[PDB]
Design a protein around this ligand. Structure first.
Ligand SMILES: Cc1cn([C@H]2C[C@H](O)[C@@H](COP(=O)(O)OP(=O)(O)OP(=O)(O)O)O2)c(=O)[nH]c1=O
Ligand SMILES: [Mg+2]
Length: 980
DNA sequence: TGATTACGAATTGC
DNA sequence: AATTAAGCAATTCGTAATCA
C-alpha cells in the first residue's frame, strides 16, 4: 500500500534494476539464486524454486520434464523384461518405458574383465507410483539402485550437477510477470551453474517477535484458554549479510506515541491484528523468516488463535505463493508438529512451526545450541554475552502487566522499543556468527538443499556425497543404493588402545607428546579401505596373491566369533585407488589450507599486545577459523562412523575392525621403535604418545648450574635450557620416526606431528593428566593449566569442587629447587582439605547450586522422587487454594537448578532436593558434610592414588579400583578425625 | 542391622 | 493418507537387593 518489495529494491539498486529490466525486455540470460524448494507428488512432477534475482526481485522458477526413474540389476533378457513388467502391472502400477545399461556395482571386488554388470531402468510419472514400485520390488527380493524414497530433489541435484544452494544461470526461458512475482518456465537442458564468483547477492530476511498477556497473575499465557490474548507483533527486514534495517513495523492494540523509526498500525480486535500481520507479510515477501524461541511459544500460539477465530485459510493463502489450499490439507501437510532436531549424541529438541511456500523458517536458538553444545545456560543473555555483544535487553513481565493495565501510550512505546531490540538481536547473532554462508557451503559440498542443512544431521550428507562421486567416476559409473540390508545384530566391535600410565608427578624430566595427523582417514588412504576392494573368501585372496597383487589381511573377534577378511592395495597408482581414498584426499586439502591460514593468523596475533583495541577481533577471527577446521574434522570422521553404522547402506564390519586394528598395530610399532632407541615413554592413547628424554642430554647445563650460587633465577635458566633442548631433540626424533614409518608401509600418508612440551607434568590416572603448556618458547608465569578430564571441567559440578581442584593443582607446579623442601602430593591434598573442612565460614549461597536435566523417558532414580514430591505438594496446595506455579515441572529436555538442604526427623537424595527459589525464600540451611563426603573425597582420592600404602598384592587384577577405594576410606577417616 | 554388588544414567576423551 | 538417527573406551554416582 505504502511501500512494497519492488519499490525498495528499485530505490536501493537503481543501475542493476535498469540492467535487469533491459535483459528481461531483450530476453537475455539472467542470474537466479534459490532459497526454498517445494515439489508436487501426485500428477506430473514439477520442481518449484523460490529465490532472488540480481537486483532483489523475488522470482519463482518451475522446472518441467524432470525424468523419474529407478534401476534394478537383473539381466538384459527380454523374458526377464516381460516378466518384470507383468509383475509390475499385476499390482495396478502404470509405467512409461524401459531401458537397459551397464554399471559397476559398489559391493565386492571384481577383476577388469568382469567389472561391469547389467541394469534395467524403469521410468515413471508422479512420485507415488515410483515409491510404491520401489517398495514392492524391494520386498519381493530384488537388488535396486538409485532408491531414494523420502526426497527426490537430492537425486536431481546430484544427477544434473546443479547445486540448489548457489547461483544458477538462466538461458532460453519463458517469462510472465504476475503482480509482484516473475513466473519463469524452464526445461532441464537449459540452466547450468555459474562457475565464476557471483555478485554480492540480495535476499531478504525478516525477524519478528510477539508479546502476549494474561489476566491471572504469575502464569505463562496459554492459547487453549479464552481471554488471554496476543497484543503486539513487531517485525523488521534486513539483507542477508547486513545488520542495518530496511523497514520495521509494529502492530498493537493499545494506543502508543508515534515514533520516527517504525510505522505503527492500530487495530481494535484480535482478528484485525492477525489480518494486518498477514497483509504486511504478503507485501514484503520475506525470503527467510526468523525469531528467537519461536518454534516453541510463538507459532503454535498464532495457529491456535487463528483456528479458534477460524481464519487460518485466509492467513495461509495470503502468505503463500503456491495455489489455493483447504484447511484440512493445511493441518495435515503444511503444519509441522513435534519435529526432532539433534544437537549432541545424547540430546534432542522439539520444534513446531508453519511452513508457507516461498519462505524458510529458521530458529536462532537451535543454531546457537548447535554451535555451542556444552553450554549450561541457554538463554538470549548468555549467548549474547558469550560472543561479545551488548547484553541487558530484557524487560520484567510484571512491569509489562502493569503497563498494559494502565493503558498509557508511553508505556506501549517503551514495550515496542524493547521488542524491536529483541527482534534486532536475532539478526545481530546471525550476522556475527556467519551462519547462512557456512550451511550454503555445506550444501554445495554435499549436493543438498538448505532446509536439510538446517533441520538434519550429517549421515545423509555423507551418503549423498559418496553416491554423487560414485556416479561421476572417470573409468565408469558406480551404482549405489540407499536402502539398508542384512540382519541386525547387537553388540560392539573392539577398538582403540590405552597404555597404563606411570602415575605421579614429574618435575625433573620434560615430557613431549606426538600424535598422528588424521589417523583413520590416513589409514583408509594407505590400505584402500573401500567397499569395491574387499575380498571375503580365502581362495580368492590366495589366487590374487598368486597372480601378483598386494593384499592387506584383517582379523578380530566379535560376539565369540572370528571376523576375517582381505583388502586390495593400490601400490601408488592413480588408476588403482579406491573411492573412499579419493573423497578423503579431496577433503584433506581444504583442511590443510585452513590450517595454514590459522597459523598465519596466530603468528600475526602473537605480535599484538593485549591492550590494543584490535585484539578482540583477531581472537574472534582465530576462533572462527578453528571452529571451521574442527567442523571439517568431524565431517571427515563421520565417514568412519557411518562405515560401521548398522542402519546405513554402507555398513561393513571388516572395514571398521581393520581400521581399529591397524591403528593399534601402528601405535605399538612406534612404541617399540622409540623404546629401543633409549628414550622413555610415559603415556599413550589411540594415537597420541608422550615421551621423555634421556639423562645424558642435560649434563652440560647441570654441571654449569652446580658450580654457581644456586639461586632461583639460575634454576629458571636451567629450566629454559632444558625445554629448549627438549624441543631440539624432539624435532629430530619426529623426523626419524616419520622416515621409519614411510619405510615400513611404503607410503607417505601416515605421519607424526609435534604438539607441545609439558613441564612440570602430573598423571593422576587413565585419561587424567595435567601440566603447564609450552608451545614454541618457554614461559612459566602463566595461569593456563591445560587440564584434560580432571572432573572440574564437567557440567553438573559445583563451584566448591572447582575451587578445591584449582587450589590443589596450581600449588604442585611452583618450581621448587632440589636442595629446598620438595613436598609430596599427599601433604598438599591434606592441607587443602583441612583448610576447607575447618573454617567453613568462607562459603556462600553460590557454591552449592547444581544443575541437572529432566528427561521423563529415562528412568533415573533421584529426580523421579523429587518430581513426585513436588507433585504431591502442588496437589496439597491446590486443595486448600493457593498459588502453585512455583512448583511447575520444567519443560522436557531442559535443565533445572537445585540445592540440598537439611531434613529433620530420609537419608536419601531426592528426599532432600529443593529448588533455588524455594530455598532462598524459606532460608533452609544447607548440609555441607553431604557435599564434602559425596563430591570432594573422590577427587582428593584420585590425586593421591599413586601412593604405595594403597597398593594391592600381586593376586588382584584391577589394582586401580582397589587403590581408589582404599584412598577414599583413608581420607574419610581423616576427615572424620579432624572435625567430628 | 552393616558390607558388598549390580545395573542404569551421566559425561569426557580419542 | 506421514516420517530421523556416525563409532568405542573409561570412570563416578545412586539406589535397591542379596549376602553374613
Ligand atoms: C574427535 C573424534 C575422533 N575420533 C577418532 C578417529 C580418529 O582417527 C581418532 C583420533 O583422532 P585425533 O588424533 O584426536 O585427531 P585426528 O588425528 O583426526 O586429527 P588431528 O591430529 O589434526 O587432531 O579418534 C572419532 O571417531 N570421532 C570423533 O569425533
Ligand atoms: Mg592426532
Amino acid at each position: 500500500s505504502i511501500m512494497d518489495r519492488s519499490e525498495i529494491v528499485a530505490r536501493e539498486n537503481p543501475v542493476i534494476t535498469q540492467r535487469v529490466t533491459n535483459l528481461l525486455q531483450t530476453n537475455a540470460p539472467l542470474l537466479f539464486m534459490p532459497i526454498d524448494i517445494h515439489e508436487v507428488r501426485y500428477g506430473a512432477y514439477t520442481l518449484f524454486m523460490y529465490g532472488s534475482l540480481e537486483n532483489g526481485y523475488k522470482a519463482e522458477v518451475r522446472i518441467e520434464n524432470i525424468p523419474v526413474f529407478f534401476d534394478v540389476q537383473i539381466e538384459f533378457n527380454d523374458t526377464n523384461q516381460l516378466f518384470l513388467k507383468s509383475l509390475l502391472t499385476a499390482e495396478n502400477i502404470v509405467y512409461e518405458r524401459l531401458e537397459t545399461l551397464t554399471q559397476r556395482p559398489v559391493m565386492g571386488y571384481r577383476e577388469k574383465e568382469k567389472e561391469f554388470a547389467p541394469y534395467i531402468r524403469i521410468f515413471f510419472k508422479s512420485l507415488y507410483e515410483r515409491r510404491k514400485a520401489i517398495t514392492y520390488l524391494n520386498n519381493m527380493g530384488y537388488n535396486t539402485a538409485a532408491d531414494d524414497t523420502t526426497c527426490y530433489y537430492r537425486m536431481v541435484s546430484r544427477e544434473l550437477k546443479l547445486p540448489l544452494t548457489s547461483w544458477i544461470q538462466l538461458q532460453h526461458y519463458s517469462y510472465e510477470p504476475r503482480g509482484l512475482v516473475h513466473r519463469f518456465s524452464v526445461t532441464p537442458e537449459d540452466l547450468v551453474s555459474y562457475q565464476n564468483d557471483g555478485p554480492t547477492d540480495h535476499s531478504i530476511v525478516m525477524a519478528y517477535d510477539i508479546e502476549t498477556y494474561s489476566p491471572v497473575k504469575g502464569t505463562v499465557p496459554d492459547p487453549n484458554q479464552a481471554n488471554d490474548v496476543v497484543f503486539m507483533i513487531c517485525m523488521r527486514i534486513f539483507w542477508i549479510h547486513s545488520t542495518e534495517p530496511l523497514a520495521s513495523t509494529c502492530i498493537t492494540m493499545a494506543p502508543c506515541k508515534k515514533s520516527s523509526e517504525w510505522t505503527t498500525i492500530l487495530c481494535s480486535s484480535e482478528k484485525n491484528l492477525l489480518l494486518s500481520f498477514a497483509e504486511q507479510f504478503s507485501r514484503w515477501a520475506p525470503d527467510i523468516c526468523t525469531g528467537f524461541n519461536d518454534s516453541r511459544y510463538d507459532w503454535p500460539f498464532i495457529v491456535e488463535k487463528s483456528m479458534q477465530h477460524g481464519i487460518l485459510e485466509e492467513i495461509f493463502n495470503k502468505m503463500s505463493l503456491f495455489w489455493h489450499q483447504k484447511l484440512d490439507t493445511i493441518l495435515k501437510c503444511y503444519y509441522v508438529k513435534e519435529k526432532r532436531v539433534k544437537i549432541s549424541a545424547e540430546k534432542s529438541i522439539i520444534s513446531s512451526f508453519l511452513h508457507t511456500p516461498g519462505c524458510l523458517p529458521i530458529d536462532v536458538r537451535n543454531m546457537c545450541m548447535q554451535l555451542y553444545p556444552k553450554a549450561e545456560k541457554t538463554s538470549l543473555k548468555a549467548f549474547l554475552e558469550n560472543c561479545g555483544l551488548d547484553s541487558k535487553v530484557d524487560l520484567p513481565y510484571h512491569l509489562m502487566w502493569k503497563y498494559y493495565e494502565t493503558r498509557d501510550s508511553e508505556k506501549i512505546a517503551d514495550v515496542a522499543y524493547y521488542c524491536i531490540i529483541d527482534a534486532q538481536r536475532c539478526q545481530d547473532l546471525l550476522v556475527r556468527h556467519n551462519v547462512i554462508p557456512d550451511r550454503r557451503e555445506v550444501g554445495i559440498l554435499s549436493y543438498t538443499s538448505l532446509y536439510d542443512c538446517i533441520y538434519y544431521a550429517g549421515g545423509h550428507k555423507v551418503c549423498n556425497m559418496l553416491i554423487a562421486y560414485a556416479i561421476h567416476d572417470e573409468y565408469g559409473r558406480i551404482a549405489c543404493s540407499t536402502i539398508a540390508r542384512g540382519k541386525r545384530e547387537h553388540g560392539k566391535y573392539p577398538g582403540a588402545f590405552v597404555i597404563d600410565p606411570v602415575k605421579g608427578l614429574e618435575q625433573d624430566k620434560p615430557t613431549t607428546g606426538l600424535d598422528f595427523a588424521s589417523l583413520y582417514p590416513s589409514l583408509i588412504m594407505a590400505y584402500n579401505f573401500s567397499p569395491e576392494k574387499f575380498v571375503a573368501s580365502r581362495d580368492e585372496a590366495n589366487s590374487l596373491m598368486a597372480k601378483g597383487e598386494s593384499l592387506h589381511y584383517v582379523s578380530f573377534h566379535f560376539n565369540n566369533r572370528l571376523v576375517e577378511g582381505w583388502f586390495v592395495r593400490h601400490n601408488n597408482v592413480p588408476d588403482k585407488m579406491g573411492l573412499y581414498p579419493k573423497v578423503l584426499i579431496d577433503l584433506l586439502n581444504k583442511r590443510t589450507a585452513l590450517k595454514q591460514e590459522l597459523k598465519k593468523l596466530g603468528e600475526k596475533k602473537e605480535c599484538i599486545h593485549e591492550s590494543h583495541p584490535g585484539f578482540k577481533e583477531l581472537q574472534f577471527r582465530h576462533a572462527m577459523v578453528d571452529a571451521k577446521q574442527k567442523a571439517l574434522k568431524i565431517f571427515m570422521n563421520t565417514f568412519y562412523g557411518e562405515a560401521g553404522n548398522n542402519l546405513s547402506p554402507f555398513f561393513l564390519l571388516p572395514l571398521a575392525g581393520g581400521v581399529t586394528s591397524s591403528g593399534q598395530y601402528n601405535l605399538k610399532l612406534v612404541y617399540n621403535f622409540v623404546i629401543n632407541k633409549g628414550y622413555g615413554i610415559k603415556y599413550g592413547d589411540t594415537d597420541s604418545l608422550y615421551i621423555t628424554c634421556p639423562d645424558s642430554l642435560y649434563t652440560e647445563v647441570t654441571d654449569a648450574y652446580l658450580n654457581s650460587q644456586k639461586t632461583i633465577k639460575h634454576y629458571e635458566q636451567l629450566c629454559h635450557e632444558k625445554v629448549l633442548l627438549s624441543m631440539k631433540a624432539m624435532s629430530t626424533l619426529c623426523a626419524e620416526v616419520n622416515e621409519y614409518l614411510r619405510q615400513d608401509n611404503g607410503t607417505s600418508y601416515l605421519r607424526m606431528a609435534y604438539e607441545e612440551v609439558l613441564f612440570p607434568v602430573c598423571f593422576t590416572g587413565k585419561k587424567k593428566y595435567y601440566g603447564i603448556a609450552h608451545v614454541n618458547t618457554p614461559n612459566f608465569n602463566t595461569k593456563e593449566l591445560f587440564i584434560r578430564g580432571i572432573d572440574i571441567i564437567k557440567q553438573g559440578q559445583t563451584k566448591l569442587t572447582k575451587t578445591i581442584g584449582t587450589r590443589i593443582m596450581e600449588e604442585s607446579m611452583k618450581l621448587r629447587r632440589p636442595e629446598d623442601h620438595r613436598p609430596p602430593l599427599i601433604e598438599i591434598v591434606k592441607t587443602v582439605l583441612k583448610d576447607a573442612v575447618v573454617n567453613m565460614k568462607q562459603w556462600n549461597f553460590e557454591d552449592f547450586i547444581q544443575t541437572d536435566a529432566w528427561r521423563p523417558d529415562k528412568d533415573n532414580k533421584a529426580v523421579q522422587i523429587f518430581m513426585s514430591r513436588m507433585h504431591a505438594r502442588r496437589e496439597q496446595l491446590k486443595k486448600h487454594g493457593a498459588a502453585a506455579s512455583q512448583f511447575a515441572e520444567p519443560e522436557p529436555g531442559e535443565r533445572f537448578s537445585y540445592v540440598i538442604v537439611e531434613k529433620q526427623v530420609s537419608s536419601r537424595k531426592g528426599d532432600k532436593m529443593e529448588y533455588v527459589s524455594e530455598a532462598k525464600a524459606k532460608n533452609l540451611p544447607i548440609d555441607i558434610l553431604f557435599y564434602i563426603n559425596n563430591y570432594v573425597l573422590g577427587l582428593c582420592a584420585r590425586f593421591i592414588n599413586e601412593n604405595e600404602e594403597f597398593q594391592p598384592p600381586d593376586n588382584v587384577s584391577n589394582k586401580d579400583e582397589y587403590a581408589q577405594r582404599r584412598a577414599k576410606s583413608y581420607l574419610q577417616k581423616f576427615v572424620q578425625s579432624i572435625h567430628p
